[PDB]
RNA sequence: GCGUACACGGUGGAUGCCCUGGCAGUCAGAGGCGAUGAAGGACGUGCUAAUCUGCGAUAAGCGUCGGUAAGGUGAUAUGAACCGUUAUAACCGGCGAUUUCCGAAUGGGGAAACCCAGUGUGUUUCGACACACUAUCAUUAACUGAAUCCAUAGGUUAAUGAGGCGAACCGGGGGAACUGAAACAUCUAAGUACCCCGAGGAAAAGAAAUCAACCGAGAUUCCCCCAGUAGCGGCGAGCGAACGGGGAGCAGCCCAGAGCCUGAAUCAGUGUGUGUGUUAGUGGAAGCGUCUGGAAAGGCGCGCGAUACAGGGUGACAGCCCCGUACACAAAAAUGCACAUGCUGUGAGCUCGAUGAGUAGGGCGGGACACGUGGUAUCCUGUCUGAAUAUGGGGGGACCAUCCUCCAAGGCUAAAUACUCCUGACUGACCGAUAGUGAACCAGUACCGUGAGGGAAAGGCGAAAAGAACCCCGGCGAGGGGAGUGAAAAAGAACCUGAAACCGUGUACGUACUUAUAUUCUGUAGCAAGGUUAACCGAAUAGGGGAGCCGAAGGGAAACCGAAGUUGCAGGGUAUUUCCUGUCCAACGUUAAUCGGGGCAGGGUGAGUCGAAACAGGUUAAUAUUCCUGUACUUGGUAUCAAAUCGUAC
């Protein structure tokens, strides 16, 4: 993991819903788009590296697009801290 | 004289006509005390294009409110794609 | 702005890209996501001094 | 080389501003020049809550095209041809009538 | 499965008849030449 | 009957005098304008017959014109306006030999006024314009190729 | 209740008008692209919900050099937000980097845009990540090297031309039926449709052992005439020539073995400098008043340039409003053609001898040649035979005699020539949305079918969106009326003019043989015993081009005596994500439904213990043993950390 770019790339930006909204009080949970490639030591190290804040359990899952027009699939992350919160 | 269509109502033509043809010649107040009990689904459909009709004319014309007539109504067919209509009416003092 | 840079060695240039990339990048990303940056000019800037500053490193 | 740029008064040859001068604000990519003065319009802009709405009805100018308008020298007072000519370093705009320079 | 298969770009394309056909799909310019 | 110098121009009585023939004449204008490469090959002796024809029917109307020369000292166009206006000339065609390069450029824009050659004389070119100016060259050049 | 005519309206799409589209040709380029990754597709591509277009993680763009440069951030199609305005806004062009995936695909598997490999190098952290390389013939030499000691067959090594797509054409090999004979065999059908092969932009062929015979010119390649003539053909339909006589072009050479003098024109590739084109571009003339007219470019009056009245736009038809045209100029760098110029290799002619030996021919058997082996002509066989070299050979027209180009067993030959997938320019007595293309429109799209394949309808507001502010009724919808912009709303977006057919109220009264090849007749016109000249040259329907097709001072028995036809034309006859949330009843429910089995936008799927390891509770509008609550459990590394991707609704 010597190389920074890589894990740069991966997560784009956070999804806004209110579920989400929900759980950045009830957990001080977030949720963050990342790329295809679901590598979540990586996705914590960018985390960390980024908004230097703490994370101990992330949860994965993918999305299909729906319909012709097509849309690609993208990974759900969901990213928990101890104490500290971070727009 | 105050023109008042209502278009592409969804009814059938012949009910619309001959629901009008009770209020045709007929004074206003009666024709709406008539339509008041009407059951008829055409009925609410053209008892919302005369209201409409007096409304607007007393907006323009209140002048005279009492002694409106009703003068011309009639109904036309209208687009097809449940053939719709058009139900026009011209309501005037005298 | 065109060749300013360009005499300025490539270990520079390196450090100034991936500060960019890692900060600005992700701040407009963040700020659009989340309804902020009414000005979206920052994003094109910061796409254009990227893709200049990229496609030197690589001749020299 | 557009014979009609910003900062610059023009005469409407035609199309109901005949004989009034205007100045021109700023021409529109698909040749449209926006003159002063010439053409008044009522527009009725749609209103929004949002966005500080004027209200009432907006008074704007509206857009003619460049053919029905000309340059104004305040030389000779009357519309004429303008060229382009070579100076010692650029080129630059100038009159007819003894082609007086701009 | 089976119509995948059957008509699939490559099960075509294996043969000389489904080149012929892809170019006959391509002259015509039809969006899709299988599927 | 040259109208500049008082001088009487001596001509083949077969070219500027033989009788008017309508069928030989329509007949060739037909082929010329069917010839326009359009969905006709016309004769050379019926050619040159048309042609004296339309010259002597042209010449008994008195509208046909010949001077002793007729040239531009410039290539400008305003000399060639004020020498047409001078014998009142506007729909008019200047026939001649050698083609020459000023007069040619001059009445190039001049749509009422076209300038040929000799040897490309057209009927159409004829009949299109009111009258013709011709030169005694020009002249002799005609009754040569025409015989 | 109906009818006799009109007005007011509706589904209404013929006529009239518009073309940002097609159809038929001419002139030049190119006449092909591609593993250094072709054509065609999937996915991303902006402040953005959808499309054209550009682009490819640098994703409506990046670096360098030139033109314009004050507008621009491509448009549909607005809005928010910025840069610059005299040279670092933006646009166009040359030169470069980037150039996602599938696609000959060529790392493996595989289902197109999917999953996973091996080698070297790069390694602030050798867990992870970045660049290049991959499957085929033999040739150069090498590492080398069984049968079989050497040697061979064979594997590897660094490079070379290829293993796909694309409209037509060259030539060759296969290759049916429909047809006349009122059916049929030989022919025609038809070498037609179709498949393959070599490279090509053109291809094959291309310079005589060729023809008539006692007289001649000899390259091939296309064209009118010869000639639609001979011949063939149930001599019927129909097919169909050449030596011969004119145009485009016309260049014949190399080795054949020795030398002489030789780096002597010149061939093939690469620098230098000029000119003319391409790839951006600059300059480039002239007017008003007056009257209708919404607006003039329309009528009237007087003037101007014209080397430029070709064309388009501009509130109606514009030389004098603009863009443009002719004309005069312009290239930092790239690029085709011309030359003088420098270099690595063949690179002038002369003499000596010659015409390419198992060669032509012939005998055992068959190929398409009507001729299947018949009297049988053409390359040759599995096989045998087989003399020479200008002193010899082939051919004949009666053979002997005598004549003719030439020398066959080695090769080449751009010139005139067929065609247009595509690029640039123009034209059309071609069409106006049921026409023209299958498609003028988000068209090779919707739709049909397992695939193949088949294949539509739908174009139009307004000069300028100036798109009806504002007010009211109404259900906050839908719809309408005032006012107003607008010429005109008898132009209101379901937006040009709008007839009938069909349905409503009022008004007056009763109750479809086609271009074309020939034959014949009618009119008309030039010339005149002559004219008619095809293909071609050509400042282009001018002038040349009489190699032809007809008639004639001839007629006649070939003893004798001594005049008028053709071609231009016009006329005619004949022969052929379903889960929930917000919206709605409009496509459907055999009435209505504001209900739903129905469309739209959003949300939802959380894993070491679901596939050696987890039990109970809570969770949202829908997911859990996955998120939180109590901790427990299998394994590994260092009390501490970790155990990947993949689906958890229906």
């Known amino acids: 993991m010597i190389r920074e770019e890589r894990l740069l790339k991966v997560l784009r930006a956070p999804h806004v819903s209110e579920k989400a909204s929900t759980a950045m009080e009830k957990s001080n949970t977030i949720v963050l788009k990342v790329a295809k490639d679901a590598t979540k030591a990586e996705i914590k190290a960018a985390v960390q590296k980024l908004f230097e804040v703490e994370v101990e359990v992330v949860n994965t899952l993918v999305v299909k697009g729906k319909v012709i027009g097509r849309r690609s699939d993208w990974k759900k992350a969901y990213v928990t801290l101890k104490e500290g919160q971070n727009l | 004289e105050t023109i008042a269509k209502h278009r592409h109502a969804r009814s059938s033509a012949q009910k619309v006509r001959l629901v009008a043809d009770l209020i045709r010649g007929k004074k206003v107040s009666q024709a709406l005390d008539i339509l008041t009990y009407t059951n008829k689904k055409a009925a609410v459909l053209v008892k919302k294009v005369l209201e409409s009709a007096i409304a607007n004319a007393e907006h323009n014309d209140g002048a005279d409110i009492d002694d409106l007539k009703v003068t011309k109504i009639f109904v036309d067919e209208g687009p097809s794609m449940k053939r719709t209509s058009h139900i026009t009416v011209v309501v005037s003092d005298r | 702005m065109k060749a300013k840079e360009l005499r300025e060695k490539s270990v520079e240039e390196l450090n100034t890209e991936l500060l960019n990339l890692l900060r600005e990048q992700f701040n407009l990303r963040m700020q659009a996501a989340s309804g902020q940056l009414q000005q979206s000019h920052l994003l094109k800037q910061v796409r254009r001094d990227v893709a200049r500053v990229k496609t030197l490193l690589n001749e020299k | ?102 | ?35 | 009957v040259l109208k500049d110098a008082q001088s009487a121009l001596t001509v083949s009585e077969t070219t500027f005098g033989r009788d008017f023939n309508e069928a030989l004449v329509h007949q060739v204008v037909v082929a010329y304008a069917a010839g326009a490469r359009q969905g006709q090959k016309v004769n050379k002796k019926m050619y040159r017959g048309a042609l004296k024809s339309i010259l002597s029917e042209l010449v008994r109307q008195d509208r046909l014109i010949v001077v002793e020369k007729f040239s531009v000292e410039a290539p400008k166009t305003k000399l060639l306006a004020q020498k047409l206006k001078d014998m009142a000339l506007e729909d008019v065609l200047i026939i001649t030999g050698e083609l020459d390069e000023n007069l040619f450029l001059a009445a190039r824009n001049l749509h009422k006024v076209d300038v040929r050659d000799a040897t490309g004389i057209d009927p159409v070119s004829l009949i299109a314009f009111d009258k013709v100016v011709m030169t005694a060259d020009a002249v002799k050049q005609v009754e040569e190729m025409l015989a």
């Open chain 4, 1 to 102: 080389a557009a014979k009609i740029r910003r900062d610059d008064e023009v005469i409407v040859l035609t199309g109901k501003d005949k004989g009034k001068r205007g100045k021109v604000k700023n021409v529109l990519s698909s040749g449209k020049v926006i003159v002063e003065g010439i053409n008044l319009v009522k527009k009725h802009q749609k209103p929004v809550p949002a966005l500080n709405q004027p209200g009432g009805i907006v008074e704007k100018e509206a857009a003619i095209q460049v053919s029905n308008v000309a340059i104004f020298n305040a030389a000779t007072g009357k519309a004429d041809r303008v060229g382009f000519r070579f100076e010692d370093g650029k080129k630059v705009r100038f009159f007819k009538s003894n082609s007086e320079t701009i």
């Open chain 5, 1 to 35: 499965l089976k119509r995948n298969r059957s008509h699939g770009f490559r099960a075509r394309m294996a043969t000389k008849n489904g080149r012929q056909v892809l170019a006959r799909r391509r002259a015509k310019g039809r969006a899709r030449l299988t599927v």
